[PDB]
Design a protein around this ligand. Structure first.
Ligand code: PXK
Ligand code: PXK
Lengths: 256, 258
């Protein structure tokens, strides 16, 4: 919904998005007392083509209602164009995992993988294909809560059919999810560091896969390997992934 | 932790309908204590994660409380079908109870129920908890002399304070307005407020200064207390400490008259 600019107080810059800086701020509505929010800005939204692309993310996001998907609060469609969203105070997942590398237990890493699998099972139930599942698109709401935060080529995360044929399906999202799980267990390290994008497909074609992260339970790595079946029809769906991640998380909690 | 094994619950008959689904009575076989009759809240749409979160948040809310006039949380079953296990109030829903006992309940019993609910609400106020859905439909009857606030799941326009209707603002003051409506329902033996009036016409009447009339046999002191609950300005409404004290005095005056 359209928000009056007077109801938004722009605060500190908290990140840099594809369209411009992201700020934290305050939304003052008659409904709720003053609420801390995130504000996506758009440097070049004076251009109608750029504005259409920027605002398309808000249109997509408004369709969802899930505990692990960031909520759209509203939009300001007059220049400067702003998207108002739910604030995830701990910020981007990659930076969070890198900073907390030796303070986050394995059970926390598996929990994040599980939570994202519930958001993705929800998207799958709505026949929605994300096309860009990666740790860089996840936000941290609290130490125990992550959310899919961006609905705006990444060769290193892509399923072979997406690279080869530009085919993006529920099965290609599962491949990308497997890469995202690897990134979480690697504490925010990017896949195939130093490898050229053009060499990635060749290695993948040859049967090579991202290695087991240190301290990753073998059951969880077996789940990642299933996400990376070359044949998309052999990849699990999110119902099975969610169920398996829940069992893996319970086994880790029981161990510790 | 409040997780209970499903094998320890024997699901019995349906005893009512809640916001999330049917409520059943059943039996809880705890490891140490004797078999206990319990109420089981079910959730028709808990396959939806958003709905499941809301349903389980009611149990997490109820877990925070311990009061003689608030239904006790016994436990939860977090696997599908998701259930909330709670204290069973054998006489059931307050509205049906007041309607059936319309010619057998004395005024002192009606005032006692208003007083008991005011003690549960003073307790919730002491914990800075805003209910947002105070209504006779959310009250259960434990015995002829004991009522309990029974639901914490949450539009109830006909019970709502004007700021809640106009601005979606819910505060301790808006709960007092709703409590005033609940007191009116009790004194009316379970008749709903504004029967036949459309929800959209409610705000217009309130803003013309219209209020629910004095129930027959309601002591003028008690109706004066309901009118204070319905001050348009939220800052002019009493708090539950004052309401509890005034209801206690009114109950004692009725008992003395009898
Ligand atoms: C990843 C990046 C650039 C920080 C972003 C963004 C959009 C956003 C939505 N909510 C929220 N909370 C913290 S950043 C953010
Ligand atoms: C809590 C709610 C939804 C008002 C209900 C109900 C039906 C019911 C009858 N007896 C009883 N005891 C505990 S809940 C219940």
């Amino acid at each position: 919904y359209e928000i009056q600019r007077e109801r938004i107080e722009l605060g500190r810059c908290i990140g840099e998005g594809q369209f411009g800086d992201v700020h934290q701020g305050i939304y003052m509505s008659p409904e709720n007392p003053a609420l801390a929010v995130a504000i996506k800005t758009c440097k070049n939204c004076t251009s109608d083509s750029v504005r259409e692309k920027f605002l398309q993310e808000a249109l997509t996001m408004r369709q969802f209602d899930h505990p692990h998907i960031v909520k759209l609060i509203g939009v300001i469609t007059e220049n400067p164009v702003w998207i108002i969203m739910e604030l995830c105070t701990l910020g981007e997942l990659r930076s969070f995992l890198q900073v907390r590398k030796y303070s986050l237990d394995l059970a926390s890493l598996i929990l994040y993988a599980y939570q994202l699998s519930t958001a993705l099972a929800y998207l799958e139930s709505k026949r929605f294909v994300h096309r860009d599942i990666a740790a860089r698109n996840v936000l941290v709401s609290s130490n125990d809560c992550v959310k899919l935060g961006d609905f705006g080529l990444p060769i290193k995360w892509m399923a072979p059919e997406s690279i080869n044929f530009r085919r993006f399906t529920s099965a290609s999202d599962v491949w990308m999810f497997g890469v995202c799980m690897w990134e979480i267990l690697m504490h925010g390290v990017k896949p195939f560091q130093g490898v050229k994008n053009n060499d990635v497909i060749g290695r993948i074609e040859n049967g090579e896969r991202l290695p087991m992260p240190p301290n990753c339970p073998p059951t969880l790595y077996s789940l990642m390997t299933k996400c990376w079946a070359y044949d998309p029809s052999r990849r699990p769906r999110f119902t099975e992934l969610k169920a398996q991640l829940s069992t893996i998380l319970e086994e880790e909690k029981a161990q510790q």
